[PDB]
């Protein structure tokens, strides 16, 4: 890719790969494109930085349906580190990527027998369970794993997503509360919890959804989803025929402020880039949904 | 038959191919064979069982279509598993909601098995609303205006790696300056015929 539609040094490629590693991006094609070149034409330049790149490129190639590079990287990693446990996990993932689940299960059982306090093998077994569509067994195994190993946020988020996919929202809301308690400075969790509470039930659930949408918008002022949700929840609560006058007028005031902010934001957006297609349209949405 | 046009098919294929590991869905519009569609608007990818953003998107798209004299008539979805092509509760709910404002609405399911690179088949399942349920009206029909041109254009667009410029409603919510009408895809399909 160097001198090929781009002009970057090997340091720039390494930094881009590291940044793609920090945030869990899953653009397999670009990762493979950069990684194969980095492995081939700059192997000696990287003193000790090639093993994590090997792992990342192998995973991306497995995701990209290109197994020759995966096998090459796996062979290199196995040759460098004999008897390691991460390499066994990679081998199991390669096995299960070809719809060979019994071998992966026996490999993970062997890993757990060698070391009983290992975490990745249990997660891979749960992934194997999920790959076959067996949702209830996966949920049960994930619940057992969380019972054994609490404080793992990835498992909590995965369980919340699985519960969302099954149209069971109370337990998903509980899991999102558990996630939000550890990370009170993250607006995305508040936004998702507000969405779940909006989708769950009726009046008090809508009140909590509005509260957490407001909290998410307070944490970050660039969150347009939070603003839209706040406006929609305020409008929904205002028109409910089982609310007192005080709550009705408070929600009307909230909706008016939200609509004004939305209109100002869309005017700001239209000022820079000239399209003028939604500023003429969002106003109609605001007008037709008034009161 | 419903006789999908070329732009809708190409945009659907591009949206399905942009996020292979996720589940994607969008909307189908028609002008105010049986009912000729004009184009499609991709709505969401990832987790789809959430109400508020779907409602906001539906309202905005309905208002925009009403401005330009269109009508929402179809709903297309693609699952995540490669061996799963049956409708779920969300698709049935959305299609039933749409059906109350327009007759003989379409429920389109993308088939992952026939999702080959260039073309092997239209890789589309069409469901029609009969009484209170949906039935697969698939008499091995041809739900396209002209299959050879459509498949050739879709194959060329896929080979050209042109799905990196497609933008759906989620990308519009992430940054307002994006456009969900996709003028670039329209220009590309107009030039490439």
């Amino acid at each position: 890719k160097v001198s090929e539609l781009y002009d970057v040094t090997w340091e720039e490629m390494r930094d881009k790969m590291r940044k793609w590693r920090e945030e869990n991006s899953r653009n397999s094609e670009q990762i493979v494109e950069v990684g194969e070149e980095l492995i081939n034409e700059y192997a000696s330049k990287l003193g000790d930085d090639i093993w994590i790149i090997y792992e990342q490129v192998m995973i991306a190639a497995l995701d990209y349906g290109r197994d020759d590079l995966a096998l090459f990287c796996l062979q290199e990693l196995r040759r460098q580190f004999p008897g390691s446990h991460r390499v066994k996990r990679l081998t199991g993932m390669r096995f299960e990527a070809m719809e060979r689940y019994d071998d992966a299960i026996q490999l993970y059982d062997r890993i757990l027998q060698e070391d009983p306090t290992n975490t990745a093998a249990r997660k891979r077994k749960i992934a194997i369970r999920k790959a076959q569509g067996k949702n209830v067994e996966a949920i049960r195994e994930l619940n057992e794993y969380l019972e054994q190993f609490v404080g793992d946020q990835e498992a909590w988020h995965e369980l919340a997503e699985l519960y969302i996919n099954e149209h069971d929202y109370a337990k998903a809301a509980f899991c999102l509360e558990e996630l939000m308690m550890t990370n009170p400075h993250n607006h995305l969790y508040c936004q998702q919890y507000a969405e779940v509470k909006y989708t769950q039930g009726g009046l008090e659930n809508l009140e909590l959804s509005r509260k957490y949408f407001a909290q998410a918008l307070k944490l970050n002022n660039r969150n347009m989803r939070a603003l839209f949700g706040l406006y929609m929840s305020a409008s929904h609560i205002a028109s409910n025929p089982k609310a007192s006058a005080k709550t009705k007028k408070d929600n009307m005031k909230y909706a008016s402020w939200a609509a004004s902010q939305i209109n100002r934001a869309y005017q700001f957006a239209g000022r820079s880039k000239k399209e003028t297609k939604y500023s003429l349209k969002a106003v109609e949405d605001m007008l037709e949904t008034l009161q | 038959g419903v006789k999908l046009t070329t732009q809708a098919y190409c945009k659907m294929v591009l949206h399905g191919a942009k996020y292979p590991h996720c589940a994607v869905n969008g909307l189908l519009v028609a002008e105010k064979h049986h009912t000729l569609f004009v184009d499609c608007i991709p709505l969401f990818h990832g987790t789809l069982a959430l109400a508020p953003m779907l409602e906001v998107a539906l309202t905005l798209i309905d208002s925009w279509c009403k401005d330009h004299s269109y009508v929402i008539a179809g709903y297309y979805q693609a699952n995540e598993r490669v061996k799963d092509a049956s409708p779920n509760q969300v698709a049935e709910k959305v299609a039933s909601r749409i059906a109350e404002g327009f007759s003989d609405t379409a429920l389109i399911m993308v088939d992952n098995t026939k999702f080959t690179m260039d073309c092997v088949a239209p890789t589309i399942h069409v469901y029609e609303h009969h009484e209170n349920r949906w039935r697969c009206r698939d008499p091995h029909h041809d739900y396209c205006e002209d299959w050879p041109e459509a498949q050739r254009i879709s194959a060329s667009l896929l080979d050209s790696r042109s799905y990196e410029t497609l933008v759906d409603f989620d990308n519009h919510l992430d940054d307002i300056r994006n456009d969900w009408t996709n003028p670039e895809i329209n220009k590309a399909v107009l030039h490439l015929c």
């Binding site: 619940n143 | 109400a51 409602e55 509760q89 959305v94």
Partner: peptide
Amino acid sequence: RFKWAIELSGYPVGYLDKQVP
């Protein structure tokens, strides 16, 4: 608010339901 509106309807460690004022 109107027209387009969809209703989806259908033991992690601690889970209780009632009172505790």
